[PDB]
């Protein structure tokens, strides 16, 4: 390759889902004491269900803490966002704006609709309404509530801003021990050396690399603003949780083989002995519905926990360091990554090196000079047609073949495809 492209791509990962709690006596029986007394004879079904749901709710906050709270040093956002030409202004919070999030985070938080707005509902909103019964009010009236997450969106945004500021000021050092400051051009030169390109390529093309980075960030802005369904996974998580809660609410209108789905009709129309059979049928059906909901929620919590473990691994290995793993943090050679807070998830902005504009060259495995075989130390032997040079693999920088660029192993009679040439000696 003779050129390169600085590519910034997004990876959207779910981290947590909504924490839900269920009151059995409100769901199965409501307010009737006969059903509560009959439900007392079913043992510890609901202690088990509440224990499982409480474990899920605790695990959600554990997932958020494991993803976003890896570093406990809240580094201050720098006053000057430009670091050697790299703009960094759209991934860091704006001091002139009332929101503590960044521009990209503000775009991301407006992309997830969040139709399941439990908290927006308070006491007095479900009562005195001019008809127009809501599904959230039906959830609250039947003992289904949504608990808020421990970390608010502002604190997650503060964690993300601290991570980005630490990456901009200290680079890879603050993920291991104390934050050691370094100019950003030298940090990018070290990352270029990490991907296999000598630092002179970064230093001689610093303005072009910074311009490509800024253009890629702007393209990320336009892709988030214009193209819909970018945050598909978080929207699917929200829709799945809301639809599961709505199904649990709508299952209360089933008879389950009883004369009616209304407990009050059964109680008021029949005496005790005849009503116990129908109430037991309704209790069995509603307990089956609750157990089914808890089982699906546990499976979804396991999937969300796996996604959050992967997100925490990516935060450790790509934000706090440079990854040599292929395709782990974007297509191409990974340079650096920036987290962005998202509703119930994290968005990673992966900065990668993509070589381009390749050129054909005639190559040889080794050079036979004075009966000795010379092998390149770091790079390949290339020929432009008349003269033989040595250059690095990922960038065409032809150099004079000297005794310092190569090393001698043996004679030029065993290597297949060797080419006779001269090795310079200073």
């Amino acid at each position: 390759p003779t050129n390169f492209t600085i590519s910034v791509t997004t990876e959207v990962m779910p981290v947590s889902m909504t924490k839900t709690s269920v009151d059995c006596t409100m769901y199965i029986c409501g307010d009737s004491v006969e059903c509560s007394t009959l439900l007392l004879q079913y043992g510890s079904f609901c202690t088990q269900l509440n224990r499982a749901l409480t474990g899920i709710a605790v695990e959600q906050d554990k997932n958020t803490q494991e993803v976003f709270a890896q570093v406990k040093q809240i580094y201050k956002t720098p006053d000057i966002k430009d670091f050697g030409g790299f703009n960094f202004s759209q991934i860091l919070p704006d001091p002139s704006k009332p929101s503590k999030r960044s521009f990209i985070e503000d775009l991301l938080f407006n992309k997830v609709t969040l139709a399941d707005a439990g908290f927006v509902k308070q006491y007095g909103d479900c009562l005195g309404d001019i008809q127009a019964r809501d599904l959230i009010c039906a959830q609250k009236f039947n003992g289904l509530t949504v608990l808020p997450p421990l970390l608010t969106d502002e604190m997650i945004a503060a964690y993300t801003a601290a991570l980005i500021s630490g990456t901009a000021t200290a680079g890879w050092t603050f993920g291991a021990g104390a934050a050691l400051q370094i100019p950003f051009a030298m940090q990018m030169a070290y990352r270029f050396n990490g991907i296999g390109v000598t630092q002179n390529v970064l230093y001689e093309n610093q303005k072009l690399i910074a311009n490509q980075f800024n253009s890629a960030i702007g393209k990320i802005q336009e892709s988030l603003t214009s193209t819909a369904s970018a945050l598909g996974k978080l929207q699917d998580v929200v829709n799945q949780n809301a639809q599961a809660l709505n199904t649990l609410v709508k299952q209360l209108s089933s008879n389950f083989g009883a004369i009616s789905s209304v407990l009050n009709d059964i109680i008021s129309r029949l005496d005790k002995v005849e009503a116990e059979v129908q109430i037991d049928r309704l209790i069995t059906g509603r307990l089956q519905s609750l157990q089914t909901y808890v089982t699906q929620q546990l499976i979804r919590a396991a999937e969300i926990r796996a996604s959050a473990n992967l997100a925490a691994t990516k935060m450790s290995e790509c934000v706090l360091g440079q990854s040599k793993r292929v395709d782990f943090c974007g297509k191409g050679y990974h340079l650096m990554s920036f987290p962005q807070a998202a509703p119930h998830g994290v968005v990673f902005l992966h900065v990668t090196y993509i070589p381009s504009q390749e050129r054909n060259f005639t190559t040889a495995p080794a050079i036979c000079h004075e009966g000795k075989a010379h092998f390149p130390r770091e790079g390949v032997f290339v020929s432009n047609g008349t003269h033989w040079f040595i250059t690095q693999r990922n960038f065409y920088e032809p150099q004079i073949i000297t005794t310092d660029n190569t090393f001698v192993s043996g004679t030029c009679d065993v290597v297949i495809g060797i080419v006779n040439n001269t090795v310079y000696d200073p």
């Binding site: 406990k72 039947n142 601290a162 000021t169």
Partner: protein, 184 residues
């Protein structure tokens, strides 16, 4: 869901509203809180239903007015405890209610005086997850001990007592960025 033509010889009772009571309207029994309703209902029909078949409204047979039916203690209530063998004091979180609406939401006039202690007090403040009663809001920031939610945590002591605080994300730090200095 039609007007009653043939009824039993049951004697009526005066209406009790804004209280958790048992009710019996046209043979349709239940338990809940009765409140004045602004609902408009089509004629020759008596009770309103839900998508979960919950009777939320009912037309009175004598005053011909619709009344809401609200279940008793429909809001979520959480109790924060430092633990047995540590203390007996508790803090109560009434989820998604305002602090001035706590006695109305939990029906504090029908509770025991021990429960009526936690219905109001000087140690009340909105925590964005509801109203917390029984814990004082300190201005310090500590690590989380008991997660209330929405950035609020609680702990015992700081005479030991339950305090509530905004959780601390970590130690505040600053890196002096320069374009020509490095730290080795």
């Amino acid at each position: 869901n039609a007007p009653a033509t043939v009824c039993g010889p049951k004697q009526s009772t005066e209406l009790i509203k804004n209280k958790c009571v048992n009710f019996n309207f046209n043979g349709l029994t239940g338990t809940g809180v009765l409140t004045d309703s602004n609902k408009k209902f089509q004629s020759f029909q008596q009770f309103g239903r839900d998508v979960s078949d919950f009777t939320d409204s009912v037309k009175d047979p004598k005053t011909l007015e619709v009344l809401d039916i609200t279940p008793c203690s429909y809001g979520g209530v959480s109790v924060i405890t430092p633990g047995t063998n540590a203390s007996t004091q508790v803090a109560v979180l009434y989820q998604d209610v305002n602090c001035t609406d706590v006695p109305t939401a939990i029906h504090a006039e029908q509770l025991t005086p021990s429960w009526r202690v936690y219905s109001t007090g000087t140690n009340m403040f909105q925590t964005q997850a509801g109203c917390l009663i029984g814990a004082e809001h300190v201005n310090n920031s500590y690590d989380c001990d008991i997660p209330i939610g929405a950035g609020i945590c609680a702990t015992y002591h700081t005479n030991k007592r339950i305090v509530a605080y905004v959780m601390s994300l970590g130690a505040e730090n600053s890196v002096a960025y320069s374009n020509n200095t490095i730290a080795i």
